[PDB]
Symmetry: C3
Subunit: 154 residues, 3 copies
């Protein structure tokens, strides 16, 4: 009966994997994931950039990144407040890179930005980026606290 039990166990585990996969698809759908599109999610909590990265990473996701107007819109609609984006120029001042690697292609900066401003007193300039209400971008200090928005694959 040992082999029969082992064979049933494999079947129990497989059925469980299948149901968990279904749970995951249903949750993404209920959270607004559009067919074939990447989806964004937030808990509406503000925190320094390093905390957003750590949080999304814990969720097996990454800090939200707009690759085009459509996604930029989706992120602002999900965030409903100023939120960090997975874009920074910490590695080399002036050159913005996606946290997941690579130079910035699409951009949607506000007029007169980025400006690596120091007048905020949080020490240093501005090497992180956040999306404001109207969808335009601004470089801000990575120490500032803004809404955490994580992104999950299409």
């Amino acid at each position: 009966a040992i082999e029969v039990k082992l064979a049933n166990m494999e079947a129990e585990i497989n059925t469980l994997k299948s149901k968990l996969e279904l749970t995951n698809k249903l949750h993404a759908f209920s959270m607004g994931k559009k067919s074939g599109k990447k989806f964004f999610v937030t808990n509406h909590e503000r925190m320094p950039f390093s905390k957003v990265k750590a949080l999304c990473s814990e969720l097996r996701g990454t800090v939200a990144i707009p690759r085009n107007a459509e996604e930029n819109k989706a992120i602002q609609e999900v965030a409903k407040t100023v939120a960090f984006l997975g874009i920074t120029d910490e590695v080399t001042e002036g050159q913005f890179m996606y946290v997941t690697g690579g130079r910035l292609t699409y951009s949607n900066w506000k007029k007169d930005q980025p400006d690596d401003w120091y007048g905020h007193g949080l020490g240093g300039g501005e090497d992180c980026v956040h999306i404001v209400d109207n969808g335009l971008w601004n470089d801000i200090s990575c120490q500032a606290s803004h809404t955490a928005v994580c992104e999950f694959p299409a």
Copy 2:
């Protein structure tokens, strides 16, 4: 002792099956499932009727079908926008059927509806049904795009 190891693993599996069921109930609850009532959910995506059916099927659910005043209002509030219902007369004009079978019973038509309007100059007349923000019903082209709402058993 393999038999002992196997028994303990079976216990672990049973615990995970209970935890996953708990996850499922908490999620249904968080998305508004009322006790002893069917559960309606949407990702707020508009799409032709053919896709709504496909998406809901992939999630092991069906296109939302209101069977009474209670459910009509519940679905209304979930969609929050004009959404398709699982009702069609595609087969035989004038004979609206439930995507899951049977002739239409409960209905909440808007004054002058159905009317199988062809004036939309798209394709045929109107063989699908959607709910307006007012909660009423209207037959519409099955190729128009409206919010996708799926339903799960009570």
Copy 3:
């Protein structure tokens, strides 16, 4: 093969435990849970207090309890309507205790409340509590039906 197959299943089970934990974490995150803080969830259903208690228990949570003004507002924002709180004076009239045990360490009683009113005609005085307008408290009949709001640990 047997022992090799069994070892693999231990790995399959452990992998599933981690994936389900990740799923639970993302869901709490999507339901608004803030880092290191407890969170509240509701399906927006009104029901008698005993129903609320049994339901939250089934979800492995407890009936929502404000421990401070901060949490009191949180509950108020999630419920959006009048909701029951996990506080009652059923054991000893006049002394409200947390359904989880212990005397109140924080209260936000409305003026002229608690009054253990009998004029409601449901029978008995008022031994339960619900948060009303402005986030203020009022003792109400446990027989009355109000929004179910459950609490889960930080």
